[PDB]
Amino acid sequence: HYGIHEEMLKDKIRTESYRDFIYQNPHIFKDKVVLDVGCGTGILSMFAAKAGAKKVLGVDQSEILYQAMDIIRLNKLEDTITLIKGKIEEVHLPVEKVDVIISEWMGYFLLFESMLDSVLYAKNKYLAKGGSVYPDICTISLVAVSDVNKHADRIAFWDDVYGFKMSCMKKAVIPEAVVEVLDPKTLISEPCGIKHIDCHTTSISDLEFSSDFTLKITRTSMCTAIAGYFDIYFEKNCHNRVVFSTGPQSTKTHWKQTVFLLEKPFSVKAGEALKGKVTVHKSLTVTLTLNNSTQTYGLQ
């Protein structure tokens, strides 16, 4: 419960990327009014204060906000940071506009249970003309996976369970997207971007999208799953730009990777251009067409 804010703090890629962005681009914060959407323990608000913010407003609907209040006092920042409990859609801020919005809002596969809707609400209601929102740029990518042993573990497993048939269970496990760190040696294609978001110009409408994709296969193997992940960019007006990836070739983060199991694994050859289609609909669902099968997946 508090453990989960602790896990996010201990995700060094996450927390240090935000730290570095803020501390190495103080001109973005100096004498500015900052809104921290979903502030949690208030760590991002404290970075922003340290980087010279004139005022920081930290908003969170959760009980964690009472901890944040005590945390702000312990660090003698109450003259700079004001915490407000509630949803961004409901609270009264003590200003009309802010100069900068910062938020750690990202869900699994970027969009599952994300706080992006709220951040966009904040942008449209509270962001000053010429203001900025960070991180400003996000992408989502897909990558092909070959792991016949894991497929066997999840699927063929059900043909004989302590001597009994359980085949019908395959159809219940296939639709459940898995959140897990992948062994990077199991990747069998180059990644393919399926979505680019700039938070300055994106609407809630753009978060439901469709994309044709082509996976450039790099190993002759059996394709058993498709994995997804996202990359986060701090770019606008930065002298020191910051990027982090949640992909399997990079240091693991608490977002891990998202895995969509294929009911029917199929063979691919190195150098092949494997084409498919992906659509995300509003909890989200992900519909995948590949090798002439189509499956919709959810994250329960």
Ligand X SMILES: O=C(NCC(=O)N1CCCC1)Nc1ccc2cnccc2c1
Q: What residue ranges bind a copy of itself (CB under 8 A)?
A: 1-3, 6, 9, 15-16, 19, 41, 43, 46-47, 50, 67, 70-71, 74-75, 157, 161-169, 172-173, 176, 300
Q: Are 170 and 153 in contact (CB under 8 A)?
A: no
Shortest separation between residue 183's beta carbon and ligand X, angstroms: 8
Tell me the C-alpha distance between 19 and 29, whole Å: 13
Cβ distance to ligand X smaller for residue 152 or 204: 152
Shortest separation between residue 5's beta carbon and a copy of itself, angstroms: 8
Does residue 261 interact with ligand X by CB under 6 A? yes
Does residue 14 interact with ligand X by CB under 6 A? no
Contacts (Cβ under 8 Å, ≥6 apart) of 7: 254
Shortest separation between residue 270's beta carbon and a copy of itself, angstroms: 33
**How is the chain split among helix, strand and coil, in percent rounded to 5?**
25, 40, 35
Shortest separation between residue 129's beta carbon and a copy of itself, angstroms: 32
C-alpha distance from residue 197 to each of 114, 168, 201, 223, 254 (Å): 14, 39, 8, 29, 21
Q: Are 128 and 97 in contact (CB under 8 A)?
A: yes
Shortest separation between residue 299's beta carbon and a copy of itself, angstroms: 10
Binder of ligand X out of 178, 192, 217, 288 (CB under 6 A)? 178
Print the SS3 string covering 142-205: EEEECCHHHHHHHCHHHHCECCECCHHHHHHHCCECEEECCCHHHECECCEEEEEEECCCCCHH
Cβ distance to ligand X smaller for residue 2 or 66: 2
Task: Find which of a copy of itself, ligand X, none residue 41 binds, CB within 5 to 8 Å per kind.
Answer: a copy of itself
Does residue 151 interact with ligand X by CB under 6 A? yes
Instruction: Copy the structure tokens of residue 113.
Output: 């249970």
Cβ distance to ligand X smaller for residue 1 or 76: 1
Q: Are 145 and 224 in contact (CB under 8 A)?
A: yes
Shortest separation between residue 19's beta carbon and a copy of itself, angstroms: 6
Q: Are 186 and 145 in contact (CB under 8 A)?
A: yes
Could you give the string, one character per residue 90-129, with x where binding to ligand X holds by CB under 6 A and - elsewhere?
Answer: ----------------------------------------
State the residue for tokens 């730009």.
Answer: 241
Residue 42 DSSP code: S
Binder of ligand X out of 6, 31, 89, 190 (CB under 6 A)? 6
Does residue 257 interact with ligand X by CB under 6 A? no
- Burial of residue 201 (CB within 10 Å: 0-12, 13-18, 19+) is exposed
Q: Are 261 and 173 in contact (CB under 8 A)?
A: yes
Residue nearest to ligand X (CB): 3
Binder of ligand X out of 14, 32, 55, 154 (CB under 6 A)? 154
Binder of ligand X out of 114, 139, 221, 224 (CB under 6 A)? 224
Given the rule CB under 6 A, which residues bind ligand X? 3, 6-7, 145, 147, 150-151, 154, 178, 180, 182, 224-225, 259, 261
